[PDB]
C-alpha cells in the first residue's frame, strides 16, 4: 500500500512468506512442542502470538497446529469439554455467589482459564439484560408513583451500567463491529438512568410521566442491543463463527439496495401524495359558488395525505401489507361521495402495481442475488478472518486479567528466546527437503 | 424410533387412562393421545420421506437436509436473538401513560394502591413473541400489535404519536427480518448447496449400498406382521 | 485424523489407493464379471462388498461397475421393472 511501483509482486512475496511461514512451524512445531514455540519471547519483549497477531498472518493463524494449541489454551486443561460447561453455565446463572466465587482470585482454582472469564462475561451481561427487562420492560416494582422512583435492582442496574463504563475506559474496546454496540448498550443507560435522576435533580415540569416511558423505551433499546451483543458472545463457536464477519460484509449491499429502495419508496410516495388530489369537473352553477367558497383555504390545502404518511404507508407495501384500498384517502377515510371521479382508481392500480412489480419483483431479488453472489466470494476467506478474530478474542482473554465488572467494579474500589527453543537449522534443511 | 416414542406415549396413555385411576376420567385425555398419534403421523410421512430414498431423483436431496441443518439452526438463533429483542420492545410501547391533569395528581395515590405484581405490561411478552414471529410471515400488520387496535379500547391510553414509533419500530423489524435474514438464508443455502450437491451425490450412493445390503443380506421380519413370526416360531 | 504430523499427505495417498481401487475393480471386472468379486470373499470370513461398505471406500462403490451390479442384486433378476412394480406396490 505504502509504494505504487508494483503492487501485485509485493503481494506475492508476502504470500510467499506467509506460507514459508505456515510450512516452518508447521515442521518446527513437531507432534505438540507448539506451546513453547508460541509462547516464545521475541526480540522485543513481547510473545510470539502477540506479534502474530499484530503481524496480522491470518493465513499463519488459521493452520492447524496454533488453532489446535489455541484451542488448547481455551480450555486451559480444564478437559469435561462440550456438556458439563454447558450445564455449568446454567450453575453460573442460578446463582450470583456460586459465580463470585469463580470470579474472584482468593478462592481462586479456575479464574486462569479463559473459558470461565468468558462464561463471566457471559452471564454478566446476561443478568444485565434481565435487569435490563425489570426495570425498562416488565416491571415489578410499579415505576409511576410521585417519588423519587428508586429501587434496589434499579440502584444494581446503575452500577452495572457505571460498572460496565468502569471496564471499557480501564479494558477498551475496539470499534470493529459488534464490539460497537457495547458502547451503544451504554449510550443507552447514560440516557435512561440519565433521564430518571435527570427526573429527580432536574425540574422535572410538573413530574411528567411521559418520562418514565422514555426511560422505558431507552432501556428497551438497551435491551435490543443487549441481544445483539450476545449475539457477539456467540462469536467462539464455529457453526456462528465466520457469520457475524459476512454481516458487515453484507451492510454493504444491504446499504447499496437501501439506497435505491430509498429514492423508489420516495418518488412513488410523492406521486401517490400527487394521485389524491379532490378534483371534479365544473358544474356551471359551481361556477358562480367558486370564489365565495375559495376563500377560506390555508396554506397547503388539496394534499389529503400527510407525505410522510405516505412514504411510511407505501414502505409496507414491500412487505405485502397495503392493498391499493390502504393508499386511497376515499377509501382511508370512509368519504361517503366519491369526490374523486371513478377513472383516477385505475391510476391507483397501474402506478401501485407499477411500483410493487419494482419493488417486490425487482429490487427484494436483486438484493437476494446480490448477497448470494457475495457471500459466495467471501464465505471461504471469512472463515480465515473467523479464526483470526477468534485468536484475538482468546488471546484478550487470556493474556488479560481483568474485571468481569457489572460485579468487580467493586474490585476496584475495595483495592483502592526463541532462538533456540527449536533445532532451526535441522528444521531448514527439512523445509528444503519438502521444496525440494 | 421417534414414531416409537409416540406410540409409547399415546397407548401409554389410554392404557394408563384404564389402568392407572384416570381422575373422574377426563376426556382430554383422550385428546392428548390423540395429539400423540397425530405427531406419529407426521413423523410417519417424514419416515416415508425417507423410504424414498432409493431413487435418484430424490436421493441426494436427503443428505443436503441437515447438511443445510447446520445453516438452518445458523440462521434460527439468530431469527430467534432478534424476535426476543423486538419482541420485548413492543412489549416495553404497549405501557399506557397520559400526561398529568393537575386534578389527576390528586387522584393519584388513592387509586394508586390497588396495582398488583406486574402491572402496566398490557401484553404477556410470549404472546409479542408469538406474535411478533409471525410478522416474518407477512401476517401482522402493524394493528395487531398496538393493544389499543387488539382490545378495541374505546379510548386512546396513548398518546397519538407512538403509533409512529410502532411503525418506526415494526418496519425496521420487518425490514432486517424480511428484507436481510430470510434472504441471507437463501445465500446461504444456496451457496453451501453448491459445495455439497457433486459429493452429496456420491454419499447418496454409498448410502444407497448400505440400504441395498441392509435388505439382502439380511433376511428379517417385516414387523406389523412378522412379530408374530418371532411368537410363532417360539 | 489420528496423527498430526502431516494430515495433507495422508489424504492424498488414500484417494491414490481409493482411485486404484476403482482402476483395479474396473479392469479386474471385465465385462460383467463384478458379481463374483464383490461377491469374493475376505481373508476373514466377510464378503468383499460389506468390507467395502466398511472400508468407506465412496470414490470406489460409486463407479458405474459396482453400481450397476449393485442395481442387479436391486432387482434380484426379477426384470418386470418400471412400471409392473409400481402397480404391484398397489397389489
Ligand atoms: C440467550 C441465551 C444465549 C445462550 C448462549 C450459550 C453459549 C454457550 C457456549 C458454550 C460453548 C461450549 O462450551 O460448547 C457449546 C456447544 C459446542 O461445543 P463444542 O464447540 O463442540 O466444544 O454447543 C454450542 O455450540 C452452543 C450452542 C449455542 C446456541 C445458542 C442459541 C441462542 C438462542 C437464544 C434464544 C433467545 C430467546
Ligand atoms: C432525538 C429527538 C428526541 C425527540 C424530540 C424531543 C422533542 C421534545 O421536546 O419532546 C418531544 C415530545 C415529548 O416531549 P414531552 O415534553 O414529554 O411532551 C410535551 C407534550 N405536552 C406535555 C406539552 C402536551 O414528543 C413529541 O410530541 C414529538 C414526537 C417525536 C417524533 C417521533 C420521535 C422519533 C423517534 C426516533
Ligand atoms: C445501521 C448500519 C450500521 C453499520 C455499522 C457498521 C459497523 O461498524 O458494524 C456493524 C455491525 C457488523 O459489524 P461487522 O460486519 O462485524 O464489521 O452490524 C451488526 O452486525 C449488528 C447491527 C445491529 C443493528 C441493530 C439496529 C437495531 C435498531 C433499533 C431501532
Ligand atoms: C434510509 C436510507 C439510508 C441510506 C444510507 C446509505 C449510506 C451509504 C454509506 O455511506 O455507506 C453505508 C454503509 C456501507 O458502507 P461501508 O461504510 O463502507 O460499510 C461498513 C463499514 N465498513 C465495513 C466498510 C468498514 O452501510 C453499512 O455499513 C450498514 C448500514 C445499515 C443500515
Ligand atoms: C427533496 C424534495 C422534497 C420535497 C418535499 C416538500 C414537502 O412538501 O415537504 C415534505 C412535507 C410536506 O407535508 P405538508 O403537506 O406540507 O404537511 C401536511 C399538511 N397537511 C397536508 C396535513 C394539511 O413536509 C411536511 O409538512 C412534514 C414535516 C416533516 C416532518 C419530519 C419528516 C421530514 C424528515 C425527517
Ligand atoms: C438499519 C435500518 C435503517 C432503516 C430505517 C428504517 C426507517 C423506517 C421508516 C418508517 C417510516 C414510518 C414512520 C414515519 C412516521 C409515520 O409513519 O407516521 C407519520 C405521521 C402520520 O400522521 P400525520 O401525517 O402527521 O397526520 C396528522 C394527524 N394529526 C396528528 C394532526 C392528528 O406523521 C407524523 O406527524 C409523524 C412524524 C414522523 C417523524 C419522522 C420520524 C423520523
Ligand atoms: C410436555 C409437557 C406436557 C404438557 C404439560 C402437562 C401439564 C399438565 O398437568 O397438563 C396440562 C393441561 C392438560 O392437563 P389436564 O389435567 O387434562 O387439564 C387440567 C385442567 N382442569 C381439568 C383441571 C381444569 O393443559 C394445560 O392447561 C397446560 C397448557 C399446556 C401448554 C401448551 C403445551 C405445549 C405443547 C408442546
Ligand atoms: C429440528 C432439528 C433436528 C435436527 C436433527 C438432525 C438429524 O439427525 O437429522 C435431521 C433430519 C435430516 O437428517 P440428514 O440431513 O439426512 O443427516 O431432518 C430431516 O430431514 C427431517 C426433519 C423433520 C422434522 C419434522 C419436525 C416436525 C415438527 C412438528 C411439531
Ligand atoms: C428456537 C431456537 C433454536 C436454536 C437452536 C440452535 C442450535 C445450535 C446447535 O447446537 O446445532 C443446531 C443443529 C445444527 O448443528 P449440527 O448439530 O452440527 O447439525 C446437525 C448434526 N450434524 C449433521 C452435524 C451431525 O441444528 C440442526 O441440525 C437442525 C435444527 C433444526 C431446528
Ligand atoms: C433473558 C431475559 C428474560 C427477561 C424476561 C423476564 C420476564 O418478564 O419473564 C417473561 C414473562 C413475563 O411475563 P409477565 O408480564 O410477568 O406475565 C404476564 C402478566 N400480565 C402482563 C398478563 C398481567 O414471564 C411470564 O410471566 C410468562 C411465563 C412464561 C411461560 C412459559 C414461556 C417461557 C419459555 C418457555
Ligand atoms: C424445527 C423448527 C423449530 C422452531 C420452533 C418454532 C416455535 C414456534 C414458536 C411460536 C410461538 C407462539 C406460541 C407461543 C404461545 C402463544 O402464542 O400464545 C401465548 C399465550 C398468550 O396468552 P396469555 O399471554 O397467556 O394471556 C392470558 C389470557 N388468559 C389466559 C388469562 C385468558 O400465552 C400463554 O399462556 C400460552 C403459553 C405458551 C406456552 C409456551 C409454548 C412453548
Ligand atoms: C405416500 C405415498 C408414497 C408412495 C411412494 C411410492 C414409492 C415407489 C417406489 C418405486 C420404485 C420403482 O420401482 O420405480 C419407480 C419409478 C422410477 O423407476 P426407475 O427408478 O427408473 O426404475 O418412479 C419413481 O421414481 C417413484 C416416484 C415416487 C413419487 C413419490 C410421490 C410422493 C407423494 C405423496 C403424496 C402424499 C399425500
Given at each position: 500500500t505504502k509504494e505504487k511501483e508494483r503492487a501485485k509482486d509485493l503481494v506475492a512475496a508476502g504470500k510467499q512468506c506467509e506460507a514459508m511461514a505456515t510450512e516452518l512451524l508447521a515442521l518446527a512445531a513437531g507432534s505438540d512442542s507448539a506451546g513453547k514455540i508460541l509462547q516464545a519471547t521475541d526480540k522485543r519483549n513481547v510473545e510470539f502470538l502477540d506479534v502474530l497477531i499484530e503481524n496480522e498472518q491470518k493465513e499463519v493463524i488459521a493452520h492447524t497446529v496454533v488453532q489446535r494449541y489455541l484451542q488448547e489454551l481455551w480450555h486451559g486443561s480444564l478437559t469435561?469439554?462440550?456438556w458439563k460447561i454447558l450445564l455449568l453455565l446454567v450453575a453460573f446463572i442460578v446463582c450470583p455467589p456460586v459465580w463470585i466465587g469463580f470470579t474472584?482470585?482468593?478462592?481462586?482454582?479456575?479464574?486462569?482459564?479463559?473459558i470461565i472469564k468468558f462464561m463471566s462475561y457471559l452471564t454478566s451481561h446476561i443478568y444485565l439484560m434481565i435487569h435490563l427487562s425489570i426495570v425498562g420492560?416488565?416491571?415489578?416494582?410499579?415505576?409511576?408513583?410521585?417519588?423519587?422512583?428508586?429501587y434496589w435492582y434499579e440502584v444494581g442496574l446503575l452500577i452495572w451500567l457505571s460498572g460496565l463504563l468502569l471496564f471499557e475506559l480501564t479494558n477498551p474496546s475496539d470499534k470493529?463491529?459488534?464490539?460497537?454496540i457495547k458502547v451503544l448498550v451504554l449510550l443507552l443507560g447514560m440516557a435512561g438512568v440519565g433521564v430518571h435522576v435527570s427526573a429527580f435533580l432536574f425540574v422535572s415540569k410538573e413530574y411528567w410521566p411521559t418520562l418514565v416511558y422514555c426511560r422505558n423505551q431507552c432501556f428497551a433499546l438497551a435491551f435490543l442491543l443487549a441481544c445483539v451483543q450476545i449475539l457477539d458472545f456467540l462469536s467462539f463457536h464455529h457453526l456462528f463463527g465466520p457469520w457475524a464477519i459476512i454481516i458487515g460484509d453484507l451492510l454493504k449491499d444491504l446499504a447499496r439496495f437501501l439506497a435505491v429502495l430509498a429514492i423508489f419508496v420516495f418518488g412513488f410516495s410523492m406521486h401517490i401524495v400527487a394521485l389524491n388530489q379532490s378534483f371534479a369537473n365544473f358544474s356551471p352553477e359551481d361556477l358562480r359558488s367558486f370564489e365565495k367558497k375559495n376563500r377560506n383555504r390555508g396554506y397547503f390545502s388539496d394534499v389529503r395525505m400527510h407525505p410522510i404518511n405516505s412514504f411510511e404507508l407505501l414502505f409496507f407495501a414491500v412487505f405485502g401489507q397495503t392493498t391499493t384500498e390502504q393508499t386511497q384517502v376515499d377509501k382511508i377515510k370512509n368519504v361517503?361521495?366519491?369526490?374523486?371521479?371513478?377513472?383516477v382508481e385505475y391510476l391507483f392500480k397501474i402506478v401501485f402495481g407499477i411500483y410493487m412489480l419494482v419493488s417486490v419483483v425487482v429490487l427484494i431479488q436483486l438484493l437476494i442475488a446480490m448477497m448470494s453472489d457475495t457471500y459466495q466470494r467471501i464465505q471461504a476467506q471469512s472463515d480465515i478472518e473467523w479464526k483470526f478474530g477468534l485468536s484475538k478474542l482468546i488471546r484478550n482473554m487470556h493474556r488479560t486479567t481483568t474485571a468481569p465488572s457489572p460485579l468487580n467494579l467493586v474490585t476496584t474500589w475495595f483495592m483502592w528466546?526463541?532462538?533456540?527453543?527449536?533445532?532451526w537449522e535441522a528444521i531448514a534443511k527439512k523445509y528444503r527437503a519438502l521444496v525440494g
Open positions: 469435561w469439554a462440550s474472584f482470585p482468593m478462592g481462586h482454582k479456575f479464574n486462569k482459564v479463559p420492560i416488565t416491571p415489578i416494582y410499579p415505576v409511576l408513583r410521585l417519588s423519587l422512583v428508586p470493529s463491529g459488534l464490539g460497537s361517503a361521495t366519491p369526490t374523486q371521479p371513478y377513472w528466546r526463541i532462538e533456540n527453543v527449536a533445532d
